[PDB]
Ligand binder design. Structure first.
Ligand code: HEM
Ligand SMILES: C[C@@H](c1ncncc1F)[C@](O)(Cn1cncn1)c1ccc(F)cc1F
Length: 530
């Protein structure tokens, strides 16, 4: 009755294994993790305290390809098979998705102790933005940064921003090669070229000021492009490796944060600190509640982060607005009439207050954000085991949770005929968003306590957007002027492009071209240009 002799053959087997020919060793080096992965998934499927796990063939990679390319189609199939809670493996991480309004509640209103945004995102954002801000700091520091930034985003600030943003749009119609309205009465444009440029010109001028805007007229502009390239999903898996892409990013962050710091120390030197812009505002208001001041480097870093985030969501969105309106001359006509009524045939100057009396214009923004949530997925890293209410499911620490309000935006259940563009579904409901009941303050002002609205373009809970009113102001001024100045349509045979879901925001697949025409071919934009 000896089993020790089997224990010998274990040792013998280990030794024969290590002496296999290389062609068999390498072969096993592949085949063993493969086989184990399959065996492990099958075993996992037995657990009742775990949501269903999407099956996958390639270890570590998981469902990355189909999630990367077609995430809403991936979610819809998964939802059909498993219901609203399911997991899937993604480049080494386990993502637990919770679709629908209950998922919105589960993730956006999760306790600070249970989940972490910075543990999910910092490896992406910190190299691009800089140290000490956003996700390179505790949540309570982020809470207060948002509060500081929000202090320059007031009604009175928006009133002074509107004419600056308008000036920038008109200058862009005047000077950009894409328009030249004093020289051309019609032309073709790629909206993925024009919208990122108009967005940076308008956001710089208003949030950063004239100096920083003037800088965009120089080679300095290319640093933003460089810094921009580092803001990609590839940094999500390979945040640092010695390629040139990574060094131009690092250099740009230094050069740009350097430029903001120079301005700041200049203003403080001359005591030229007023109430013009976000820089003025963070110079007067950036001391945390424990007495610690933000450094000039941290202020600069925060400016980069805020502008870059606001850059991509807004540029994506105005691109989509243009793209949906290009096959909807009926809606352009309707918007044009509202412009004529609110601005007295154009004899009134556009102001912030008049912007608020343009419901059809804001409804168009609202509907575009419904069909095109620029962030298709939001993540948190799970920090403690989470029990899913009314289920037997437990999400263990180390998993990630993924929420996707953009997906629910496209469901017929919540939005009848959700794939049709219809600004009138928001009739009598043109607010950018609104809390349906009770409110709470996490540090940056009172916001909706419930996050169960099927429409959640700005998220909710402690990580909620603070730029929505600035985005509406910017998009509003911009579209008010496009509409009053131009008509536009598609080249023959072209229609609304499909989304490119592989980028950081879900911009349209380019080239996305429209043909524009002056409503008033003889109208001229004044001012000087070289
Ligand atoms: C159409 C435009 C925009 C949309 C749809 C949008 C959307 C969002 C969403 C969904 C979040 C929540 C992120 C999460 O829960 O993980 C967020 C957060 C945030 N956004 Fe926006 N955003 C827009 C424009 C802007 C602009 C223009 C700014 C700045 C001027 C801005 C600044 C911020 C900041 C500072 C946060 C907080 C991040 C956090 O607490 O984790 N956003 N935004
Ligand atoms: C972290 C980042 C993000 N990017 C992509 N998928 C998910 C994300 F959370 C983002 O939320 C995007 N964003 C939101 N509003 C504008 N931009 C963000 C927030 C604050 C910020 F200062 C800069 C910034 F990029």
């Amino acid at each position: 009755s000896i089993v020790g002799e089997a224990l010998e053959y274990v040792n013998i087997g280990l030794s024969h294994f290590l002496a296999l020919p290389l062609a068999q060793r390498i072969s096993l080096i592949i085949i063993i993790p493969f086989i184990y992965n399959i065996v492990w998934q099958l075993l996992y499927s037995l657990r009742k305290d775990r949501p269903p796990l999407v099956f996958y063939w390639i270890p570590w990679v998981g469902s990355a390809v189909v999630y990367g390319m077609k995430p809403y189609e991936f979610f819809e199939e998964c939802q059909k098979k498993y219901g609203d809670i399911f997991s899937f493996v993604l480049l080494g991480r386990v993502m637990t998705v919770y679709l629908g309004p209950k998922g919105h509640e589960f993730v956006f209103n999760a306790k600070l102790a249970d989940v972490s945004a910075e543990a999910a995102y910092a490896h992406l954002t910190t190299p691009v933005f800089g140290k000490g801000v956003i996700f390179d700091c505790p949540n309570s520091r982020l809470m207060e940064q948002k509060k500081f930034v929000k202090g320059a985003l007031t009604k009175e600030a928006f009133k002074s921003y509107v004419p600056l943003i308008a000036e920038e749009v008109y200058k862009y119609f005047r000077d950009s090669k894409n328009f030249r309205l004093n020289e051309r009465t019609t032309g073709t444009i790629d909206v993925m070229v024009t919208q990122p440029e108009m967005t940076i010109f308008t956001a710089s001028r208003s949030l950063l000021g004239k100096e920083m805007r003037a800088k965009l007229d120089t080679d300095f502009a290319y640093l933003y492009s460089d810094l921009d390239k580092g803001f990609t999903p590839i940094n999500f898996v390979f945040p640092n490796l010695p390629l040139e892409h990574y060094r131009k990013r690092d250099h740009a962050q230094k050069a740009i944060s350097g430029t903001y710091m120079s301005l700041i120390k200049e203003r403080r030197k001359n005591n030229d600190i007023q109430d013009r812009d976000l820089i003025d505002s963070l110079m007067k208001n950036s001391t945390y509640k424990d007495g610690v001041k933000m450094t000039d480097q941290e202020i600069a870093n925060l400016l980069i982060g805020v502008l870059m985030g606001g850059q991509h969501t807004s540029a994506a969105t105005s691109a989509w607005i243009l793209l949906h309106l290009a096959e909807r001359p009926d809606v352009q006509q309707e918007l044009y009439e509202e412009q004529m009524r609110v601005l007295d045939g154009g004899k009134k100057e556009l102001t912030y207050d008049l912007l608020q009396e343009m419901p059809l214009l804001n409804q168009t923004i609202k509907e575009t954000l419904r069909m095109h949530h620029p962030l298709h997925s939001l993540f948190r890293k799970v920090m403690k085991d989470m029990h899913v209410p009314n289920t037997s499911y437990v999400i263990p620490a180390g998993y990630h949770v993924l929420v996707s309000p953009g997906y629910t935006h496209l469901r017929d259940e919540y939005f009848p005929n959700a794939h049709q563009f219809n600004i009138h579904r928001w009739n009598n409901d043109s607010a950018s968003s609104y809390s349906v009941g009770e409110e709470v303050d996490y540090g940056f002002g009172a916001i909706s306590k419930g996050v169960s609205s099927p429409y959640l373009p700005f998220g909710g809970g402690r990580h909620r957007c603070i730029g929505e009113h600035f985005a509406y102001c910017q998009l509003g001024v911009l579209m008010s002027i496009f509409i009053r100045t131009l008509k536009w349509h598609y080249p023959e045979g072209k229609t609304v492009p499909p989304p490119d879901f592989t980028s950081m925001v879900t911009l349209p697949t380019g080239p996305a071209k429209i043909i524009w025409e002056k409503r008033n071919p003889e109208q001229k934009i004044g001012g000087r240009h070289h």
